[PDB]
Design a protein around this ligand. Structure first.
Ligand SMILES: *Cc1cc2c(nc3c(=O)[nH]c(=O)nc-3n2C[C@H](O)[C@H](O)[C@H](O)COP(=O)(O)OP(=O)(O)OC[C@H]2O[C@@H](n3cnc4c(N)ncnc43)[C@H](O)[C@@H]2O)c(*)c1C
Ligand SMILES: Cc1cc2nc3c(=O)[nH]c(=O)nc-3n(C[C@H](O)[C@H](O)[C@H](O)COP(=O)(O)OP(=O)(O)OC[C@H]3O[C@@H](n4cnc5c(N)ncnc54)[C@H](O)[C@@H]3O)c2cc1C
Lengths: 498, 498
């Protein structure tokens, strides 16, 4: 048993500074903090937080740096509390749950959970994403249809909070109702990070009583995944062929995203993008994976493809290769390109005029390096939980839809922004440019933040940003915010305001 | 301090088996063990070793799986002890040194040592190389010319050994003179892994008394590095131009590998290979890095280049890019292609007839997917230590030469093996086809093991394999081998035998 790495205050002249300053995934955002505070223990965080209160310096937390907005990297932020050293992944006998510290990467968590106890959490696809912001934002992934969101497995949370006088306090907030700080736990079941305080620990556990046996405490990953990726050719893709595909795909998820459907083990995202000769994971492709544990795994995959590619000429279907769980270790580089992604939920399939709006903007994209629309699979075991039981209100969705643009040169930022905002405003034109909760839309997802939803120039409808993300859960979140962060010390562009 | 990850005994029907079986780097080697023993603590290691004594099963340890031989992955090995869970990197006040556990990936070690204390160890370039085999095998890297080998910083080691009755015993061996197990420490200063017992902990520390301050205990890495990669075109690479280059590069390292040399902060490996259509880090190239902390880094860089590329027409020199320490460590996958690499030391430059031999074999390479001769920069601060002081005798060399082949198809192995062995036998033709300690050669390096040297067919000289690797230090290693492994429980193709 050893002492943790002590607190290190990384000033601009210190050689580590530039590394910690630029470790954000999105290269759009550049903050110039006074110092970056590296922490190794909960107490070090408390000492860091108190100093930011005492000095009146704007503080932001960072674990993975995979924030889509400038919540960490902006001119106004003067202190970055960097959770890089807090990387513990172990079973806690005291809590009878798995302790996952914020500074861990999803790739590092899946790795340690798999080899150690043959378990996993239904988190993000990307290996490079950090735990801290991912979980309390309501993390989901390719196993979410089979197990739910990660927040459905969040038992407890250790948070550092500031009282009105300005002093730090460490609270362990649990799931149980007899806990005095039940509200604080609930705020972290998809309430988004950078609001209530600094999370120093996550405790992950299956809600049901499975005894002290640790291998039952978290979802068991499929031993093998039966994987296939369907390619589509733009050159032969007409409007009629495009409308058919999205209708086929949308309809399939309308009737196969049930909680007790045999397609809970199947996940696929339809990636509608332009082709970049060098950039991998682009173009017009549809990665599809199914749980291969069941003997009828191949039928489920085959019945999925043919329903989607029915009457769709330009489609390429290779032979489904059965690969093991974590056969190839992820971690898509470090510093990514400058990008802007806008998000929306789907209860039903995209309307025919929305599909038309997608095709129009995908056809008209001159001077765009990368521009895509992804239709990520959702629902299933997610839609068993009450909209109010967790901080995530969207317990009705079948698809998550993202609108992405990327660019190599910062000079063309405005050029790309216009296109992705034109795409977004054309699709949700009938509901004031934004996915207002409807029979089709259900709102937005806080792990995909969009500061345009708070801007009056980009959100023409009267519906505010916080109603789009939180819906009926919003009034409760302000109640938590005012209780645990009355000084409003933790804030950003899309922070909860009392 | 939560209890360590429990001992999981991975049987063949277990979903984890194939992942843990195939996590070796070189895909030429396969093995079918009865079980793979994952361990979380030193006690779990000792218990696993005793079980293999009781069952009589042949055992092999694994950290990063980056063995260039069949030491871990061979049909005879029935138990793998996997150290993946033992990944601790913290400051140890008891030893006043840095505790680094074997299961750690090198990339992770530099990352945590840099962030936590602004320190580093002068070890390997490759990211996914495990600490376990690396340090006890006399690990080296770019900073070795300025700091020496990693073994020059090895203060202590925790080893699990077996007495002749078959019982496990945990021993902590230190650098100190009075230590009753000084020999066991010396055994791990370049003696190679898989010999004396299972290494469960390393302790890294500067020899000088620097006090209790952790920031002083290890070398502080350069803040920034000045980098350049000189490309060479095979199209204009005649025999005269080739001989000129290797003579220039050879003679430069003859004059500039002194411990007092200003070029101790400069490192360059000459990669003489064929350009593989779709695979980076191959072809005819020469990456050069220099410590940008020095006031004349650019004057030293260009001086090194102009001397090497002197009278070499197809040399292509780019503009030098300055990048910070650990600016980006991407990680080039996990499972690499099947390769066979043969190594050797160089005290002086390759003779004209040896350069002739290289050019001859680099011209004629039909069916060869990849084939290269690497001349890795060495010496400098390494050469300060006495040959007998550590287990590494070669404290005189200026370069480390590697002879590498690579194939994509398992069928084409025999063809590739013939060519690389032809290359090796052609270069060392005067001294029995091996680098017998000479005016030029100085044996081989143990972290690049070569079982061909123990083979009487491929090694046709009156010099055995161990005299090449260990030289004068071999007799003493046999003594330590007999003292701490009398049963010879830990053995492979190139293990120390009494
Ligand atoms: C694949 C690879 C290797 C490299 C590369 N570049 C290097 C460099 O730039 N400098 C170097 O000094 N070395 C470089 N190497 C070679 C590696 O350093 C060696 O091949 C190491 O031996 C690798 O160690 P490891 O990752 O642990 O490989 P394993 O197969 O796990 O172990 C090898 C050997 O070690 C024995 N052993 C004894 N005790 C232990 C413990 N406690 N833990 C692990 N292993 C132990 C094993 O029995 C086995 O025989 C660049 C690249 C791409
Ligand atoms: C390439 C990429 C791929 C992605 N893939 C997926 C995916 O597959 N599935 C999915 O659901 N999401 C995905 N996301 C979105 C991701 O889940 C969110 O952006 C998440 O908030 C990232 O958190 P982080 O800690 O890694 O990054 P950060 O920027 O460190 O965290 C974001 C926010 O968390 C706040 N925060 C508050 N407390 C803490 C704390 N204790 N530790 C850390 N941060 C804290 C920070 O202040 C910041 O505002 C992806 C994002 C990227 C960039």
């Amino acid at each position: 048993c050893l002492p943790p790495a002590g607190p290190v205050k990384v000033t601009p002249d210190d050689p580590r500074y530039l590394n910690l300053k630029l470790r954000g995934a999105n290269s759009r955002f550049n903050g110039e903090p006074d110092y970056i505070h590296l922490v190794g223990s909960t107490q070090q965080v408390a000492d860091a937080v108190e100093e930011t209160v005492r000095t009146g310096k704007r503080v932001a937390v960072r674990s993975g740096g995979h924030c889509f907005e400038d919540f960490v990297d902006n001119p106004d932020v003067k202190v970055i509390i960097d959770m890089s050293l807090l990387t513990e992944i172990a079973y806690d006998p005291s809590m009878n749950a798995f302790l996952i510290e914020p500074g861990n990467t999803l790739s590092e968590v899946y790795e340690k959970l798999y080899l150690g106890w043959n378990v996993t959490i239904p988190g993000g696809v990307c290996g490079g994403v950090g735990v801290g912001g991912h979980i309390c934002g309501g993390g989901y992934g390719p196993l979410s249809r089979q197990f739910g969101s990660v927040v459905d497995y969040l038992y407890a949370v250790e948070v550092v909070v500031v009282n009105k006088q300005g002093k730090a306090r460490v609270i362990v907030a649990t799931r149980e109702r007899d806990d005095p700080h039940h509200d604080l736990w609930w705020a972290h079941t998809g309430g988004g990070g950078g609001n209530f305080g600094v999370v120093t620990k996550y405790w992950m556990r299956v809600p049901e009583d499975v005894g002290r046996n640790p291998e039952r405490l978290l979802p068991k990953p499929p031993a093998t995944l039966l994987t296939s990726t369907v390619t589509f050719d733009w050159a032969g893709m007409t409007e009629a062929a495009f409308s058919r595909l999205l209708r086929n795909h949308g309809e399939w998820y309308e009737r196969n995203s049930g909680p007790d459907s045999p397609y809970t083990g199947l996940w696929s995202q339809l990636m509608i993008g332009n082709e970049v000769p060098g950039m991998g994971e682009s173009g017009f492709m549809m990665p599809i994976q199914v749980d291969a544990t069941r003997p009828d795994a191949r039928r489920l995959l085959d019945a999925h493809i043919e329903a989607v590619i029915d009457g769709v000429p330009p489609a390429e279907v290779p032979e489904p290769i059965e690969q093991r769980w974590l056969a190839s270790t992820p971690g898509r580089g470090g510093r990514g390109p400058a990008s802007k992604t806008k998000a929306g939920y789907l209860r039903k399939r995209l309307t025919d005029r929305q599909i038309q709006a997608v095709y129009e903007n995908m056809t008209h994209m001159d001077g765009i390096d990368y521009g895509a629309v992804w239709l990520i699979g959702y629902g299933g075991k997610v839609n068993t939980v009450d909209p109010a039981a967790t901080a995530l209100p969207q317990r009705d969705a079948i698809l998550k839809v993202n609108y992405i643009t990327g660019w190599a040169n910062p000079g063309n930022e405005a050029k790309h922004l216009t296109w992705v905002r034109k795409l977004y405003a054309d699709v949700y034109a009938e509901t004031g440019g934004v996915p207002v909760p409807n029979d089709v839309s259900d709102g937005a997802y806080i792990n995909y933040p969009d500061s345009d939803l708070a801007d009056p120039g980009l959100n023409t409808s009267g519906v505010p940003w916080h109603d789009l993300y939180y819906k009926g859960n919003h009034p409760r979140l302000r109640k938590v915010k005012a209780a645990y962060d009355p000084r409003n010390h933790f804030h950003h562009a899309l922070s909860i305001r009392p």
